[PDB]
Design a protein around this ligand. Structure first.
Ligand SMILES: [Ca+2]
Ligand SMILES: [Ca+2]
Lengths: 277, 285, 287, 280
């Protein structure tokens, strides 16, 4: 009295699209990742300068995605190594690299699949990179299965070990302290890109935030993604213990330095930590 | 009111986390499977190169590219190759291979794109036509007959045949489903397409609706290297007579048709029961 | 981290709201179906009453009670009836009927309870035994063979047979699956068990595994009364072949029985021209 | 590339258990509804007394369930008509009536299936009842599909139309204002029935755009677990919701665990029982 499937989950076959690849939600989501490849001048400006003032040439993007950020760094003469756990995501970055393969810069761009929970064996780095970047509020995608945030610790741990001694780590996340408080996603302010009907859902388990779900809509169909609502306080100690303390933490609020008490409400918090030992 | 809640929509990815069901046990054994199939027998290679040279083909379209095995061989032998597949999961391996051999001139000229038989006419720039179109590995049988009138089969064949230039060649095969349907079991492991250095056990399920064979589901039980698991795939059981009619009709009859049984010419009623039927069609013009 | 979230667990109910999938389109068509089946043909009734009287049966156990149609007939004809089924959804209609006719002395004495063939021994108080045990309407074929060795079938039949007192009777039937398996189609609408005043169109699916028939799925397309609308529901069965079943039911008695088989209420002779839609096995327990 | 099912959802077959009726969750859930069929003395005391002081004899239980509440009223001489949308729930009520069928009182007990959203056509009352009861926080089981609480309005409206002019309507709900604030629903903090089963309850609150939308409860017992969801009604909104069901022609009144509720009061009730007396 069960249900028989035509083909095992995760199995592909020549000649037919992979499972759910042509679904309604997938289509809308396609437009989303596609109509966001266009970053903001301010962001690009902040990022380029930030890495300069630290003497960084070898960059590791651990949340590669479609490689929009990584592509910029390649064009700017950086030595880029892009990684992600999502092959569906990587497909776009790899397609871009092949198209611009004639440009010596792109031919040297390294794109590989890796998972934060096994980033150590998946990516042989040895010494470390001058900078490890994880932007776009991607870390929050990693949920908490066991409920003790053990996976969060392992993820940040491995992401940190990738930063060479005296190296820089730029990891961000949305402002969930404010989302949990208002139960809504901040205004449609154009900060990270110039790209909607977003329903926000907060799930609390025993009064402790556990997950934030977003239902993106466009006109007749929609798609959703869930996030672990990291709060500035806990995240600040979370990323620091990833190093053990040997670092110089700093927090930005939409690119400008964040000042506890400050009147302005940031949309995102960018943590810049400079590894020491 | 019962209802299924989702953390993320089906088919949606997010940076930093493995896709939908990429790490399930089934998917893992299957990956070992495609890993042990990346090799062709010498007999197969010689037959395919022989057929192509025999007709003087140069521009070849591989519509069931898959991981690229056949396409790579053709690239190495100096043909002009365009490989296409509807599965991104499998195309991934072909693209990876092309990138690693990016420096070899012939590989820098290897065209690989996503395309669906059902919308081939638009997914790929045709008009010109290819000297030869190949669809091997019993790939066509992966397409189900959802509507029940085989309309999708006809639309796929038609589009595939419209990629063949006048006087061009079409090579397409399928397992011998007449034998499977009559004995209810896939023939015992032999497969002369590739050398399987990994033992297998196939459980065969045949679904017949109103007495018409509709689907054949295969449960492949692979012997995991030092550690037994399995994965499942389904096929439309195309029979010789019906397929013969189907592929000719996709040319409007404007073609020369012949069929091989495991690389050798096939004669109706012959004692030797082939595991694969290969239809070779020479388009009139 | 993909995972399905639920509002309520499967199989759980809550007052004030309809159960799981009680109002779906399939469940609604299916309900119309059982409603148009609540009637037997005169020929079926005469045959069943005739058989029971012919062996002087008084205490009857209907192990596939369903909505209770056959049971109700027996209650009315004066038999001592105990009706049992494993499906609460179907037992609901039999219980409703008994309650409405509760004033009639015979119905107040009609026993209806929940019981599973697999645990029949404990679900119902036996020991004594019943004069006749009936399992009709091709109900037995609903039990699948999950394990693949028919152990469930053997367990169910043995439990069903143990309800038959020595010298007692067991009547159990099944559709003609030999025909279905060889033609791949259920026979064209006739069904001599009941009068179907509702048009149907049956699509037949046969699943064979390693060449052994394993399941037959029937999609019933019912013509919804005014909507000339068409909807359908699906149900599966274990394709029991005559020879196999014959062996199976006798072994449920350890061979201690007299066996005969009818083809649509008439004696069946292997090789006869008439191909029956149903096979009814009638066994007289030795003791 | 989809999934073929053996049988259609909601379709039963003689000889085999209905779908999911034998699952792990269904079992644990069975114990839950069974080890609660034993109400509290304070509750009974309260209920019986309440209906007496109003001159009620014909009672309609619109959230019948396993019939525990109705059974009590039948034993007390009330003319009872029990109704519920859940056939799996009614099964227990019906089985109890049949076993006590020999007692005249139970022979007159009417148990039928009806849905709040169609209570008008499902149940022909015409005149009405002296009292309509919906306790055990059952109304909260009705979710809000369209998101505008229209179903809630229709449900309460039909339930109210069942109360005869000058009649009584006793409807309740847990204290969600407090559960939303603490994010937890005290496991065992009942008042209607003293639970004798060990339970570990995990509370999940789901907020959609900062507006409470649903509370989910994961009941665990010893290794197995099941869950149910509720629409978290707040005293304020519910209070206007039940009143607009009549239109305002009634005398609202609120209790907190049987004792009258006084806004400001220090005691935090577990349940709020709204006793409205229809006028026009
Ligand atoms: Ca056949
Ligand atoms: Ca039936």
């Amino acid at each position: 009295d069960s249900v028989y499937r035509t083909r095992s989950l995760g199995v592909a076959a020549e000649g037919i699209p992979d499972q759910y690849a042509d679904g309604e939600a997938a289509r809308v989501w396609q437009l989303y990742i596609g109509d966001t490849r266009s970053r903001t001048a301010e962001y690009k400006a902040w990022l380029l300068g930030l890495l300069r003032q630290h003497g960084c040439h070898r960059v590791l993007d651990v949340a590669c995605g479609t490689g929009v950020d990584s592509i910029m760094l390649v064009e700017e003469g950086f030595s880029v190594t892009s990684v992600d756990a999502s092959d569906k995501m990587l497909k776009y970055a790899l397609k871009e690299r092949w198209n611009r393969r004639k440009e010596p810069a792109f031919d040297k761009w390294v794109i590989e699949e890796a998972n934060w929970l096994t980033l150590d064996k998946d990516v042989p780095a040895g010494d470390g990179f001058d900078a490890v970047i994880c932007l776009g509020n991607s870390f929050a995608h990693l949920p908490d299965s066991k409920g003790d945030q053990s996976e969060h610790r392992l993820a940040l741990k491995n992401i940190a070990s990738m930063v060479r001694p005296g190296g820089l780590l730029v990891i961000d996340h949305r402002n969930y302290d404010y989302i949990l408080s208002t139960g809504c996603a901040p205004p449609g302010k154009n900060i990270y890109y110039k790209s909607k009907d977003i329903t926000t859902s907060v799930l609390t388990v025993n009064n402790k935030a556990h997950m934030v779900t977003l239902d993106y809509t466009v006109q007749f169909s929609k798609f959703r993604l869930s996030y672990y609502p990291h709060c500035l306080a806990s995240f600040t100690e979370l990323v620091q213990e990833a190093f053990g303390g040997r670092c110089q933490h700093s927090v930005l609020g939409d690119f400008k330095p964040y000042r506890p008490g400050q009147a302005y409400v940031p949309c995102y918090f960018i943590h810049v930590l400079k590894k020491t030992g």
